[PDB]
Design a protein around this ligand. Structure first.
Ligand code: Y13
Ligand code: CO
Length: 166
């Protein structure tokens, strides 16, 4: 089923999500509704609070060569934790909770994370480029952080302008 996506400046997006403790059928349906909702709004990443669920879980499905998304590659990360981070780069980002606005944000260019899949299985994942960015972006949601929060002083004004523009 489709879920309503929460948009800035909703204070719900400032929520600190909680660890998932029960990996049951209820949790799996939520993840399924999140995937259906993400694809429907044509997103590549989605965190639980973006649909009102204060749980520390998020999904990521980057499009491949053909430029299309294949559910086969969808990542479901729960209770993520950074093991290591390195480098720095500027990446223009977007967000389903902040539709119509895109801006460069500084991110680690490489990250290694630890999490669990929907079956509570522990996983370790190293990532760079787009995948590393999506991971950092989505995890920020779990801590109530939006990418517009990380904008430089100048690009911050650009947001307020384009915001009053809509
Ligand atoms: O999926 C999205 C955004 C979707 C979107 C769709 C329609 C719009 O009009 C819009 O403003 C945003 N973001 C996933 C997280 C993410 C952001 C930046 C990036 O480089 C990697 C990952
Ligand atoms: Co987002």
């Amino acid at each position: 089923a489709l879920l309503e996506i929460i948009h800035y400046p909703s204070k719900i997006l400032r929520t600190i999500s909680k660890e998932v403790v029960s990996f049951d059928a209820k949790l799996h349906q939520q993840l399924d509704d999140m995937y259906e909702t993400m694809i429907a709004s044509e997103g590549i990443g989605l965190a639980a609070i973006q649909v009102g669920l204060p749980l520390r879980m998020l999904i990521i499905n980057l499009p491949q060569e053909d430029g299309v998304q294949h559910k086969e590659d969808c990542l479901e990360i729960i209770n993520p934790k950074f093991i290591e981070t390195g480098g720095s780069m500027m990446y223009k980002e977007g967000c389903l909770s902040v539709p119509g606005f895109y801006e460069e944000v500084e991110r680690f260019e490489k990250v290694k994370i630890e999490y669990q899949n929907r079956f509570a299985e522990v996983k370790v994942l190293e990532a760079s480029e787009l995948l590393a960015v999506a991971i950092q972006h989505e995890i920020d949601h779990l801590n109530g952080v939006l990418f517009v929060d990380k904008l430089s002083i100048l690009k911050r004004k650009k947001f307020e302008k384009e915001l009053k523009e809509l």
